[PDB]
């Protein structure tokens, strides 16, 4: 209640504490990507990069809230969970 | 077995007027003898374990029960042939049943396959099976790199030979993308770094580059594993980044090493329309990109040769419907360039492989669809590009088609 | 970790700017959030703020204050400096929810639930440019939502005109892919739009708003 989004919860008041086949959406079969084409134009770690688990893997689709009267599942409030793993945060 | 095709036997041999209870006594007894025959061919099917029932299967189950293995033919005397069997008939259904008897003569025979060799290879080490070709195959935590520090070095060798520094390093670290079983979920990295990298190499036109790139791209192609069409979304514009493109390095000379490129880059086009494709998306996109390419006034003469080629090498029918209504335009064209006034661009030298090309494709469209009468004069309806030299090229073909 | 107290004031004044007062402060508030160089260790919660928001919407059917939300999220686009790749699975439903949910409106007649539609839907075309990659899958889940969210019936004409707009602002090969097999539904549209019998339903500006 106290942490980020405060000011909603108080504002809220709440006080405890063949179409569909899967090629048919690959970028390849809906992008124009003939335009890209330039004409005349004028180890210890890993030599590779560390992406954001939840949104590689996560499905955030869940979250998304296609109706607010029938919300199929029920959602609970987030607590703020401070990843170190981006860089450009002191702790 | 039907009683209705054992009176067809009986009457077909001298014996007619056979009753029914005569003639169903003949389907009961032969019907048990295939049943307890098959029955017994099964024993030598599971003691070859190949579950397949073959052809020898029945020789040796007919030799069991004390019947020759004779098929087509049987001695009474026995002694010619025993139970040694002759391998059945090849007799089909839908045969001709009259052949000529100098063409099973003529035809070549079948190559005698490899024999038998022992090969050994790991199904299991320590517990786990490896992927080798022999196999079917609050804080949030600190996250890891979904690779292995092999699989980060692998790739870092991998890239570090692909772009050509020696070339027997290259030539195997392609065969090594064209066959490694594991090189997926290290397919998105691959993919970027050929993107990415014709992206900022025609920035400055370095062909080696591009020369290695479009090898890597051909080395991921035919690998079997790997599954690419979610890939090939960001591997169309790489590969073609310059195939049409003209050059900012020295583009008169080693226009001819990369007029091959663009050769090698139609050839992966083509294979592309040949696979990956659904309807209406990929091969007709790269068409009508490649058309009007072509319909373009005042266009890029190192374009006006790469787009040429891709149109070129699209198949039998494309140059059968693309390259006909347009042999004036290509002819203007190459009137101009010879005009002059001035040699301001390698446009003579671009024109010349463009004029070259159209001619050799024109040539085999016109072996392929009539007659080689008027060879001499007749092509002058057609303004008369390659003439009686174009007549030569089509005899040349038919030369190689007299050779086959 | 824990918003010193400069920055936690800074997240009062902007984040009080933008909930409707007055109208120079909050085109201040977002010209702020757009053109500064320091705003990371508050971008978790702009996104926290802004999510919440658009959920806030089920409880008070607020056209304006999505508006504004939606206008914040336009801001936070277009700062250089700021990566919003590590909190675009949060930013994504909330636009989401502002282009395919049914009521958008207190009053549903006269309220312009509309231009919320394509604003969001144009919001999420630039939030697909930007952001999609091939590990991402992104624009083929959204794509994949819209598509699944147009071609099944029984969805009202609110939630079929967010999805042809987020739709039809993808691109040209998407309405070739997608729009164009479907056209025969207008007929089953212009069923009920030039012939009654019932006219005084909100089934009619729905209706020729989505023709």
């Known amino acids: 209640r106290y942490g980020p989004a405060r000011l909603w919860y108080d504002m809220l008041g709440v006080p405890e504490d063949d179409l569909l086949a899967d090629e048919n959406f690959l970028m390849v079969t809906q992008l124009h990507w003939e335009d890209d084409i330039i004409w005349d134009g004028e180890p210890w770690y890993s030599i590779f990069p560390i992406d954001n688990e939840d949104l590689v893997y996560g499905r955030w689709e869940d979250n998304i809230i296609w109706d607010a009267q029938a919300m199929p599942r029920l959602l609970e409030p987030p607590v703020l969970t401070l990843d170190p793993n981006d860089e450009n945060l002191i702790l | ?404």
Request: with cysteine; net charge neutral; hydrophobic share 40%.
């Open chain 2, 1 to 404: 077995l039907p009683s209705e095709s054992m009176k067809v036997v009986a009457e077909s041999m001298g014996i007619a007027q056979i009753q029914e209870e005569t003639c169903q006594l003949l389907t009961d007894e032969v019907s048990y003898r295939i049943k307890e025959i098959a029955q017994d061919a099964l024993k030598f099917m599971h003691m070859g374990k190949r579950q397949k029932l073959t052809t020898s299967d029945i020789d040796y189950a007919l030799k069991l029960k004390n019947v020759e293995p004779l098929y087509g033919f049987h001695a009474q005397e026995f002694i010619p042939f025993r139970f040694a069997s002759g391998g059945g008939r090849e007799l089909y259904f839908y045969e001709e049943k009259e052949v000529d008897l100098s063409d099973i003569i003529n035809t070549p025979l079948p190559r005698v396959p490899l024999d038998v060799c022992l090969k050994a290879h790991w199904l299991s080490i320590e517990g786990c099976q490896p992927a080798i070709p022999e196999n079917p195959p609050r804080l949030k935590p600190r996250s890891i790199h979904e690779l292995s520090v092999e699989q980060q070095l692998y790739y870092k060798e991998i890239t570090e030979a692909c772009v050509g520094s020696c070339e027997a390093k290259r030539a195997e670290a392609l065969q090594s993308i064209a066959t490694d079983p594991g090189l997926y979920q290290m397919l998105p990295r691959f993919s970027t770094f050929i993107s990415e990298g014709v992206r900022v190499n025609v920035v400055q036109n370095n062909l080696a580059l591009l020369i290695y790139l479009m090898r890597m791209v051909k080395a991921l192609m035919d690998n079997p594993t790997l599954y690419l069409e979610k890939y090939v979304h960001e591997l169309i514009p790489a590969v073609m980044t310059c195939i049409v493109s003209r050059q900012l390095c020295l583009r008169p000379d080693v226009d001819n090493h990369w007029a091959l490129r663009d050769f090698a880059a139609r050839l992966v086009a083509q294979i592309c329309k040949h696979f990956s494709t659904t309807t209406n998306n990929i091969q007709s996109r790269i068409t009508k990109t490649f058309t009007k390419s072509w319909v373009d006034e005042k266009t890029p003469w190192t374009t006006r040769y790469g787009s040429i080629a891709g149109l070129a090498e699209l198949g039998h029918d494309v140059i059968k419907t693309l390259i006909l209504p347009r042999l004036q335009q290509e002819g203007e064209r190459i009137r101009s360039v010879l005009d002059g006034p001035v040699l301001s661009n390698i446009d003579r030298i671009g024109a010349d492989h463009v004029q070259s090309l159209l001619l050799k494709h024109c040539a085999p469209v016109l072996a392929k669809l009539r007659p080689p009468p008027d060879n001499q004069d007749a092509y002058r309806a057609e303004f008369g590009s390659l003439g009686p030299l174009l007549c030569s090229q089509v005899v040349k073909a038919r030369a190689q088609a007299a050779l086959q």
